[PDB]
Amino acid sequence: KLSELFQMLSVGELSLIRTGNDGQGIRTQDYPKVIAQLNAGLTNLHARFPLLEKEVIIQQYEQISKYYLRSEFAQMNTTSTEKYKYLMDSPTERFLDDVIRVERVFDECGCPLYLNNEPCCGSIVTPSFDCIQIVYPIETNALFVTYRANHPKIALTTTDLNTEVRIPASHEKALTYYIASQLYSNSPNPETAAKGVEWSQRFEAECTKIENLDLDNAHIAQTNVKPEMRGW
Amino acid sequence: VVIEPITNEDLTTKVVDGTGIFDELMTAANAHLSAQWDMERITGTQYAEV
Secondary structure, three states: OHHHHHHHHHHHHOOOOHHHHHHOOOOOOOHHHHHHHHHHHHHHHHHHOOOOEEEEEEEOOOOOOEEEOOHHHEOOOOOOOOOOOOEEOOOOOOOOOOEEEEEEEEOOOOOEEOEOOOOOOOOEEOOOOOEEEOOOOOOOOEEEEEEEEOOOOOOOOOOOOOOOOOOOOOOHHHHHHHHHHHHHOOOOOHHHHHHHHHHHHHHHHHHHHHHHHOOOOOOOOOOOOHHHHHOO | OOOOOOOHHHOOOOOOOOOOHHHHHHHHHHHHHHHHHOOOOOOHHHHHHO
16 A cells, blocks of 8 residues: 555655655655655556556547547546547546557457558557557447556545555565655765665666566567468 | 862763763763664764764
């Protein structure tokens, strides 16, 4: 939970600094400063490691060819006045703007489609960082975009400490070292800047350790299918 | 008023928590040192060095 992370930061890592309040808990006024750094740390960990991969269904409309990955066009977000909401969200999968990289794209039946392929004029291109361009949209089709997902963003004004930070206990130290590095690096004092650099190096060492141990089952080899494809 | 003689026991009682003036000044400086040290701001070596 966020309370545990705040206590851990207050005593042990952010101890000899103002934000830690001498190990008596993070002040209720410095929340929008640890939370901003925490969002960056969670984004870094969720982009460098595959801690959350999710899929989103994009319903194709006859007059729309550029589909934006924004919650304003979501089926569950009822606050938006968009006439056509092509994102197909469910109470289970909500699509809270947590998109880090669009990896794979499928169709309604389940056949993979090419992504960003120029020679094949049947591929789904990506114009901008959050858009999906379908040159050939059909009113009776739906996409099945799968992406690497981010942690649901914790608002800067969040006050409830029961908001759960969903990271494995192995990356707790990596996140904490990242937060310490980011908070220690703001000041231009050489002595404090050196500590910030040391925290950055230690965070990059923890990440290297987790990569070397593959605690998230990311770098796992697959069955070779090249002989079958080449006709052996 | 009754003036008292200035003896050796008024400066140092030869104990760490003595009743002398030097002992009281050491206790007062040690109070600030302990207040700072109770917030993990200085290590024991630096505590003794200061």
